[PDB]
Design a binder for this molecule. Structure first.
Ligand SMILES: Nc1nc2c(ncn2[C@@H]2O[C@H](COP(=O)(O)OP(=O)(O)O)[C@@H](O)[C@H]2O)c(=O)[nH]1
Length: 307
């Protein structure tokens, strides 16, 4: 076939939560896998594929906050993990850094995926500041292990969630907003992989921009009316949740989707917004897709790397 296989793997409590919320929202052409030391949380997982790691180590009661326990559980379940991953051309590993299962096992899962040739993308959170300095330091070590294990890594500091809520936004909704990064990135990459464009981008272009690239920005912006293209681009590159800014980006995959009214001029304006915002000359892998069922709506998908 010529259709890449995409899998999303949630490791630990936060990653399993992300998996479950993405499933609830509705995702179609992606295989979800849940990996955990916590048997109860895994029994509540909506993922079609489930891997309880560290069963003898932990008896399904969790790894605690020893990254080494989660790491050992993952390494001891390597074969199960590999069998679950087999067939994947692209693998998204999502996890909450700080704990023992995510922080320790997500890099092992990512390394396993990377050594099977899958384009391996990490989307991990850092703990809130109020969780303390030891938690944040452990999260940092986990983030560096992730960087060493993945093709590219998106970090979402939980503190940024305090910048998008008002005083009454339910925690559930804010966590759904954090998960939207991963979900909308997966959906955009999927659509781009699948849909032929007037300037065509395929999976190999995604690899070009994301293979062995370290830190990354992943964003999407939708807009309508006058100045829609510029505004969608600005939305795409200006997410308050992402640690990495677009500045200093050396590579960028950029796709623009619109109706049949999509003008070359406004696509140029969007690409200029992105190319200038980097404050650098950026290797842009650029694409355009005409979705005739859109009308006055323009969607700008951006993936930046090279920091
Ligand atoms: N955004 C978000 N962050 C989470 C969620 N659950 C946990 N976290 C964060 O991830 C860290 C690790 O928690 P968790 O994944 O449950 O620990 P582990 O499963 O033992 O590795 C926590 O300290 C939180 O900062 C979630 O549902 N959403």
């Amino acid at each position: 076939s010529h259709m890449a296989t995409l899998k999303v793997i949630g490791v630990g409590g936060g990653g399993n939560n992300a998996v479950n919320r993405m499933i609830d929202h509705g995702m179609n052409n992606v295989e979800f896998i849940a990996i955990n030391t916590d048997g109860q949380a895994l029994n509540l997982s909506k993922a079609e594929s489930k891997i309880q790691i560290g069963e003898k180590l932990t008896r399904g009661l969790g790894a605690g906050a020893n990254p080494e326990i989660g790491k050992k559980a993952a390494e001891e379940s390597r074969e199960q993990i590999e069998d679950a991953i087999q067939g994947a051309d692209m693998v998204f590993v999502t996890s909450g850094m700080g704990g023992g299962t995510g922080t320790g096992a997500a890099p092992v899962v990512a390394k396993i995926a990377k050594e099977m040739g899958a384009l391996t993308v990490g989307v991990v959170t850092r703990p809130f500041s109020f969780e303390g300095r030891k938690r944040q330091t452990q999260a940092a070590a986990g983030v560096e292990a992730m960087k060493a294990a993945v093709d590219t890594l998106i970090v979402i500091p939980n503190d940024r969630l305090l910048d998008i809520v008002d005083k009454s936004t339910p925690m559930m909704e804010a966590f759904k907003e954090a998960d939207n990064v991963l979900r909308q990135g997966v959906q955009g990459i999927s659509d781009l992989i699948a849909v032929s464009g007037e300037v065509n981008l395929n999976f190999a272009d995604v690899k070009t921009i994301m293979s062995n690239q370290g830190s990354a920005l992943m964003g999407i912006g939708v807009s309508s009316g006058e100045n829609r293209a510029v505004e969608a681009a600005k939305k795409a590159i200006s997410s308050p949740l992402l640690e990495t800014s677009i500045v200093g980006a050396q590579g960028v995959l950029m796709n623009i989707t619109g109706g049949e009214s999509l003008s070359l001029f406004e696509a140029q304006e969007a690409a200029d917004i992105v190319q200038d915002a980097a404050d650098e000359d950026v290797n842009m892998i650029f694409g355009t897709v005409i979705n005739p069922e859109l009308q006055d709506e323009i969607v700008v998908t951006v993936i930046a790397t090279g920091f």
